[PDB]
Amino acid sequence: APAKFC
Amino acid sequence: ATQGVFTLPANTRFGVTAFANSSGTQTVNVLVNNETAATFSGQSTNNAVIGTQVLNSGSSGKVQVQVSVNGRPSDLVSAQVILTNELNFALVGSEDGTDNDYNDAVVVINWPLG
Amino acid sequence: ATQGVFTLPANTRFGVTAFANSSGTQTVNVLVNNETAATFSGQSTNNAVIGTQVLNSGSSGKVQVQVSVNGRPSDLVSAQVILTNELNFALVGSEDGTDNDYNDAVVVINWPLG
Ligand SMILES: *C(=O)C[C@@H]1O[C@@H](C)[C@@H](O)[C@@H](O)[C@@H]1O
Ligand SMILES: *C(=O)C[C@@H]1O[C@@H](C)[C@@H](O)[C@@H](O)[C@@H]1O
Numbered sequence: 001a002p003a004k005f006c
Numbered sequence: 007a008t009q010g011v012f013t014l015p016a017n018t019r020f021g022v023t024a025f026a027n028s029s030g031t032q033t034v035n036v037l038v039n040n041e042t043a044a045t046f047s048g049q050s051t052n053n054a055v056i057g058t059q060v061l062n063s064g065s066s067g068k069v070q071v072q073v074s075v076n077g078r079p080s081d082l083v084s085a086q087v088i089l090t091n092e093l094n095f096a097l098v099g100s101e102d103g104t105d106n107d108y109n110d111a112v113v114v115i116n117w118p119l120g
Numbered sequence: 121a122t123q124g125v126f127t128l129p130a131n132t133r134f135g136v137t138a139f140a141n142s143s144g145t146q147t148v149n150v151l152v153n154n155e156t157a158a159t160f161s162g163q164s165t166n167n168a169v170i171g172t173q174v175l176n177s178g179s180s181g182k183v184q185v186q187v188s189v190n191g192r193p194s195d196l197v198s199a200q201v202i203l204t205n206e207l208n209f210a211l212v213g214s215e216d217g218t219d220n221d222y223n224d225a226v227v228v229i230n231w232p233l234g
């Protein structure tokens with residue numbers, strides 16, 4: 001469950 | 007030009023509602039007099055309401071809408087429209103990607119209430 | 121003039137949401153090609169969402185919004201506004217009484233979706 005920011 | 011920034015009449019209640027149409031999780035911030043007054047968050051590709059609330063425009067009447075996805079500001083388009091000199095709509099669209107449908111978070115502000 | 125009637129691009133999905141700001145119970149009918157396709161009901165003086173749904177504009181693309189309060193047709197005002205030649209809003213306010221704030225039921229239609 002790939003989580004990302006910016 | 008600057009987009010998503012609206013001058014409301016002072017000390018007036020307004021509704022703000024945010025819709026989603028993107029596989030990206032939308033973060034909407036509503037600022038009153040430069041202070042974050044409300045924050046909505048959600049993901050939907052079927053126009054789901056990801057937040058709704060009543061705010062007061064305060065002494066300055068300045069309301070600003072900001073949209074970001076995973077902490078990346080979306081590009082904004084906006085306008086205000088007034089019907090029979092009474093009913094106010096402030097409208098925001100945003101784009102978090104490349105396809106330019108500008109609906110990824112749609113934000114609607116309306117006043118007066120009651 | 122006629123109000124609350126909108127020609128959309130054919131066979132297009134669109135959002136429709138209704139707000140309430142009256143002490144009267146608001147009834148909102150949305151017709152697609154002159155046939156009822158959605159109906160919302162609710163009472164609020166706090167801009168509560170009384171309904172939200174996605175519809176298809178069908179082959180004609182004709183969409184009509186009606187508002188009643190306890191069987192009584194409300195006076196409508198409407199307009200459509202398009203942002204960056206892509207994001208569409210169809211806006212309706214209505215008056216059920218005498219103060220003319222025209223927010224008694226506020227209906228917002230937006231497209232494209234997705
Ligand atoms: C990917 O996140 C693109 C994002 O979601 C698509 C399904 C579509 O709604 C597009 O407009 C949006 O930018
Ligand atoms: C009733 O007198 C009028 C009805 O309800 C009020 C609370 C207010 O919202 C008014 O605008 C509406 O027409």
Ligand SMILES: [Ca+2]
Nearest residue numbers: 103107108110
């Ligand atoms: Ca997009």
Ligand SMILES: [Ca+2]
Nearest residue numbers: 027028110234
């Ligand atoms: Ca989209």
Ligand SMILES: [Ca+2]
Nearest residue numbers: 217220221224
């Ligand atoms: Ca009224």
Ligand SMILES: [Ca+2]
Nearest residue numbers: 120141142224
């Ligand atoms: Ca009212």
